Amino acid sequence: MMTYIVFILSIIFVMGFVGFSSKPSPIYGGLGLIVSGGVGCGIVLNFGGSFLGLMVFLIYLGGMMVVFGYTTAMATEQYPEVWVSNKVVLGTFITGLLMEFLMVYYVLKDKEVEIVFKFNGMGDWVIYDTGDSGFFSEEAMGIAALYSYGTWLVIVTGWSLLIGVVVIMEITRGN
């Protein structure tokens, strides 16, 4: 059960996009994309990609999806919902989320194990710890090489970010 955990997260990841590709609201759309970002980050972190998972949290979720929720909250005029005493205002939430985990556990059925067991990855998929690397994360040093090897990449990226600042300030003027 514990072996297939990345695969399990990937299934949840797929289900997470069905949370918001059906598009119930842009606000619940942002909420589903935040949950999907967290579980895809779990997929990244379970291959030893620690810095890239923390870039998912720090830059994608805490950097950009904050701005998406911020711009969404400056639009789409709100309206109240059901606000009866606690047999509705939290009990329906708990029964709905228990049905959501019921849906998560419900898809691991006989139509799934014909794909899981015929194409068993866990046992031979996650091979990032194949031998020794040394005193360094290879992924950390590969990201560190952006400054010595990636001179042109850093030039065009910083130029695109400066042009991004200029472009946003020109189009958001109205004059």
Added chain:
Amino acid sequence: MFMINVLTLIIPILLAVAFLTLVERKVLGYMQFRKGPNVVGPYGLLQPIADAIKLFIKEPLRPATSSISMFILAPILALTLALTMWIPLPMPYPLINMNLGVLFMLAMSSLAVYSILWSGWASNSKYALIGALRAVAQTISYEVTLAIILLSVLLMNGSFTLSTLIITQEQVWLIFPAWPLAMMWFISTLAETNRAPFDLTEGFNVEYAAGPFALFFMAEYANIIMMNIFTTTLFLGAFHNPYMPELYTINFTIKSLLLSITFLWIRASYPRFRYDQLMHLLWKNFLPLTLALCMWHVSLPILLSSIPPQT
């Protein structure tokens, strides 16, 4: 055995947050020439327990919520991110010893504005939504200088490891080569938690009951104690004997208490900023100095041949 360690982290956090209210009211009492609470318990030691039992049986306001799910998930996220910021903190050895604990804490604190934003949209008020948007803009503003100051200090560390930050400061405190980063870091952590003189929420989560307000309240104070401990580890790092870890634990405890009382002593001393005045403080005062000191702490270990070890 590990679950025992998680409980012995998280239960004393909640007890320390409970008695921080007593320490705040007593220290703000004596600084305002008055006394703080002394009637309820002996010298006030039952005032947090009485306040907690009062807030946890107070009537829910029957809130006209714009959403159920964000109304529930804002205190849940607030408490979860209040607790999970503590697990890489080296005291002198953390609960979760990870190689990127600094970046982990920066990420989990950058995720902490969703509790504000979801509390704001989960209210029906447009005024509460405007206050929440102002608070979110303030917090993500000061997260910029959190990240740049933190990067500039860790150019002397070698890596994002918090336990390595104890090894870095065994000869000198890191406030000596980095005191402008220290003072701007301290004002930036003051402005993260919406703490005075940056508390324009008392100048967004009032849609909640008194119980969920106590949850946001205790998450805010856990963030206050946590950022004081993180500043203590980051600039005033204590001596560590590996055969007696209680020397380091008592030393950073005393320094963390002094820095938390320094928050309590700042809030009883200054008027509040106007909102554009603290946006002026960030974007026009702290950010040029912070970028210049980032350039300085990049280029300075290269010119002094003091580049810290990677491992």
Added chain:
Amino acid sequence: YPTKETAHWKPPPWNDVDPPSNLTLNFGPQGVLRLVMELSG
């Protein structure tokens, strides 16, 4: 060619521009004073 679905389509403006308030708060009694604020941001 004006068909059935295209007959109500008016031509666009000649210079290609199209013809397009501020907030009012009530700081109530929540001394005491009520403040009606025409605010502009």
Added chain:
Amino acid sequence: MWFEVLPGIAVMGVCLFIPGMATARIHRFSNGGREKRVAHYSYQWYLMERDRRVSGVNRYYVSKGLENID
């Protein structure tokens, strides 16, 4: 007077002292009277699993010295 704030500060200081003392004692309890092995890197984990294999009881913290070689 001013020393009246000291019982609350003392209680809060004990509440901050308990987690660090607790995790230091648990690390010495679960690792043979010593510190927990820090494996931030692949070499540290490789030596750690080599210790776990040479100890024979699936525990890295049982150190086999010169008595295990002839």
Added chain:
Amino acid sequence: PFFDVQKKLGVDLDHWMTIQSAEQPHRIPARCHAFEKEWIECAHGIGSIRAEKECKIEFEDFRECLLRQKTMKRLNAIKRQRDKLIKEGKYTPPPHHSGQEDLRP
């Protein structure tokens, strides 16, 4: 329009990230360094049309090093036969695959 400025002027703007067998930091190998090196040294300079049909063995070794589809197929076959024999009761697992043998070093 492929204006090869990087070969005209003699600059290295993006050749270093292109293949796995290039100069990596701290001489880290890729997982398929030998297979990609052999596909590149086989298919070098002869053009794509000859490279598709005259270096297919090295290219399939490198593709199978990348995806490991034949190796996962073989391991699924052996594990399926092992599961069927454990289910039939005609086979017993060894002690060195059950966890009672006090591993090598």
Added chain:
Amino acid sequence: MNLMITLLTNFTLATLLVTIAFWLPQLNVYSEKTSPDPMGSARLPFSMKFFLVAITFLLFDLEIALLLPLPWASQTTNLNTMLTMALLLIFLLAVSLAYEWTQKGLEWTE
């Protein structure tokens, strides 16, 4: 593994405290109350300044995302190139800040 157990315990304690904070005063049969702020029925006007400071956060946060591997890039052999590109990124962050300055972008939240 220990991290997932710790996150799960923190999430369980958070959900438990929220559940106690909602269900414990709903034992009370206090009163069903009626008759439902600085606006009564006003819509939300948009503010351009809040969106400008949000996008300014996002662009400088991307520049910080580039600046993050510097404590690892200090360990490299090509220190002249590394120092030039580090100073170039922080200088471009400063040029973005100066352009945000002079075009009145930092005004009325300065």
Added chain:
Amino acid sequence: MSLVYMNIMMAFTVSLTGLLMYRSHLMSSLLCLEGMMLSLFILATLMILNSHFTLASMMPIILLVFAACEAALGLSLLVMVSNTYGTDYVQNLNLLQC
């Protein structure tokens, strides 16, 4: 091909189908577009960490930064639409039929 890569591709195509059937809002379009960007980040990261190809580890961050800047541009466009009509509705964006 492989399994978890097929899952990340399935998420990419699901957010593509959400990006190709608009319901009401432009923010829903930008969210489906950034879910596509997220799935590209995840799949690129798993490939680059799988092969131990070291220099490409800076590539997903690059794939983040530009595209996040791209999202910023999209948000600003939405804002100007919401400054003309009051809503971000895609059916207000139909003046270019003639």
Added chain:
Amino acid sequence: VAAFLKNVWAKEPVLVASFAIAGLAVILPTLSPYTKYSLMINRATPYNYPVPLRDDGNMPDVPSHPQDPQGPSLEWLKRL
């Protein structure tokens, strides 16, 4: 160029401090003698294995044992 400097130090000391710190951060790594030692320490830090060479017969600069005279030595790093 001096009265303007006193004026900007009077009005805006934050930007004067920022441009001074940034200017020193630019110029001082080249005006320093200790900058080369950063390069030398980062290229003498052994992250990999020092793979030995087959002795063809004529290599005077390559030692046979780590405790030999010839070879790159770090006496300067131990002493400084």
Added chain:
Amino acid sequence: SRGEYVVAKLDDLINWARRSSLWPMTFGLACCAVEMMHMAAPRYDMDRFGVVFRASPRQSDVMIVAGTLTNKMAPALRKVYDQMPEPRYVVSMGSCANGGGYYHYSYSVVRGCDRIVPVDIYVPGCPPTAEALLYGILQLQKKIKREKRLRIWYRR
């Protein structure tokens, strides 16, 4: 019995927690707000009783009507009273909030705030001294102390 003892001890617990943690929402209507400010000033010092200074109305426990209630503000008084969570309490401070006071026969004055809100403690004086307002607060705490909520729950 046993359950009578359990509900009596839990009544003592919740009454202790509610009376030792009263949070006031003071209506600063008139001159009595000055003497409430003196009751929060260091000499009398409400904060050492657990009575915090200027709590927000959506979490406060006791409404102190300190000053003259006029006809233009009585709906705002009842609105802020309706926005208070239970158990809410009303302390009426001074003669104009008690019964109209010096403006009793005025065309514009509500003759007592107990025409608007249910009032628990009547604090007399013009203004009552801050020591007397503190006496009224402690008498409110003793009124909360002798409540019998779980006892009457167990007996109904």
